[model samples]
Target: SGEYPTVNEIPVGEVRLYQIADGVWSHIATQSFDGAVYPSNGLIVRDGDELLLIDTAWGAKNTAALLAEIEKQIGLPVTRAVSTHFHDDRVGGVDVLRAAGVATYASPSTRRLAEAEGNEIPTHSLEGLSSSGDAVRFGPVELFYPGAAHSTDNLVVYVPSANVLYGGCAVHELSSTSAGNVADADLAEWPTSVERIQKHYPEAEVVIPGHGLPGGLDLLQHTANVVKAHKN
Candidate 1:
């Protein structure tokens, strides 16, 4: 396991950016929905002149500002964006990114749910979207769907270079005691799903939840425990 001894936090309106690795950054935006405020996490990976954005800010306005801030930090715009799920915090800015000439990709489940929710549709779709074991690589990151946890369309992003696992919604912060929301979650199978992630990325030193700071592999077991406890 590696350590990010130095952590940088930069605030830009509703978006708070953190640099966790040499070229790996996490962007968190605050979203107010259903009478509550939730922190939505996204990723910006700089691979030379190419930037791969995982998910977007809460909405189009915040996502646009986020892109500008990313360019300022890395000197390059996002060439590719991948939505991890169908939630507004994840894929709300797909239309905006597409209009900017950025190619956005998502799983078929994400497209179906987004369309049903009347949200923005991704420009590209990955094959075998329903296969929990399949992964799609883009630049320096790998996007995978280890079954459903938080949402039916939720997916995880692994950066092998950084040994970081971006477990979006599927995993929770270390301090969390339960899966946040079950309205769209498959709680019965949550533990199995997270275990699958842990099995696949045993070398993940930095584990990031969808809404909080990064942790170690413990986060995976913590999330599984949370689900097990709740399910019991």
Candidate 2:
């Protein structure tokens, strides 16, 4: 671990694992959103020497436990965390990653949102990534944001090797039927984003939502249905 100071020490704990897709692992949360009722799921893609964490859980406890589980699972440290959206729950764990010298990455727009909202975003900044329409290559996987869905700055990470697409909140496992959460949602433009994602990867074998379990192309199809339903 790096010598930098972390907000709180993440206790080394047992690893909890779920097979989401081909090579995707879901770090099922025992607690979510400040230890709320419904558990949430985050993604773990094994790169060469490190693991790329999709979205960190709600707060300190969620992040700490996830780290412990990672240590137990691979015995290696997390080198990067990609924030799918700017929710406090997803980005709150920034402190843990920063302390370990593991850089965090997110959309440039997200950084701006953080500045404007002040408290909603964390203190971390994205590292080694530049904004682009195509996928960004990591150790063994690729990250891409097809467009927007749940949030405008929502980023979708794709693992071409595994034929798995991390839809983030843009095209979640649930309904894209309406403007579900409005904090940073752009319902007017969401349909375009969803269609863009679907059109770009018709070959994607699986799609993973930021919140719930993973699914197939039906995920994309249902998203269109929901967005159109709600837009009308």
Candidate 3:
């Protein structure tokens, strides 16, 4: 229960990292949403001498700090990066990551959706691997699109070595009794996506939501149930 603790805190946004699993760290960045501070969950996976960042960890400047702090405290550089969806919480640091020499990746749709919102686009594309069931390998990280859930372009990142599933905004934390946000979500497809995710990554012991601590398969089911209940 006391296994994962705050590894370190960076300067901006009350950003911090937690060792959630072997070679996997959860990077939480904060931002003021509706006048209240909220946390966003990203991931850092150690691979060989490099690291793979799941999301950019929020903001452009603070993203630099996340990379710098990782190098400072974790003793390695993030060589590969990927965004889960179009949201700022996911793609906010795409430019920063690319500028820092990290090979950033995202689904083609992620680029399109993020562009609609006017966020800096990812430098490189996943190259045709964007639709539901499409997956591509990037070192130890596997980027998958289960289907449209929280966002039309949402991605579910899986690290087979650590058995961790970074579900991003598509999945919800246990406390979420309602569908948190549906600005661009497909409610009918949300539960369908989660079910497919559970089928494909049943071995995932660590499930990370976009804005909460890590949990297991229950998080997947929780998200599905919330969406179903919201139907009127």
Select the stronger candidate by TM-score from 2 and 3: 3
- Positional deviation of 55 in candidate 3, in angstroms? 0.7
RMSD of each: 3.4, 7.0, 2.5
For candidate 1, give the lDDT of residue 110. 89
What shift in Å separates residue 9 of candidate 2 from its native position after superposition? 26
> What's the TM-score of each model vs. the native?
0.91, 0.80, 0.92
Q: Write the per-residue lDDT of candidate 2 for residues 1-232, one digit (tens) a residue.
A: 4221111322222225666555567765534233434445578887766688888765666777778877876676688787777776567677776676667867666777756775345445544444335566766666666566677677777787788887867775653345445567766777787787887778888787655657787887777677677767
Per-residue lDDT of model 1, residues 213-232, tens digit only? 68999999999888888877
Measured on C-alpha atoms, candidate 1 has an lDDT of 0.83
Runs in model 2 lying further than 4 Å from the true structure: 1-15, 21-23, 30-36, 119-134, 174-179
Task: Supply candidate 2's per-residue lDDT for 99.
Answer: 74
**Per-model lDDT:** 0.83, 0.66, 0.82
User: Model 2: C-alpha RMSD to truth?
Assistant: 7.0
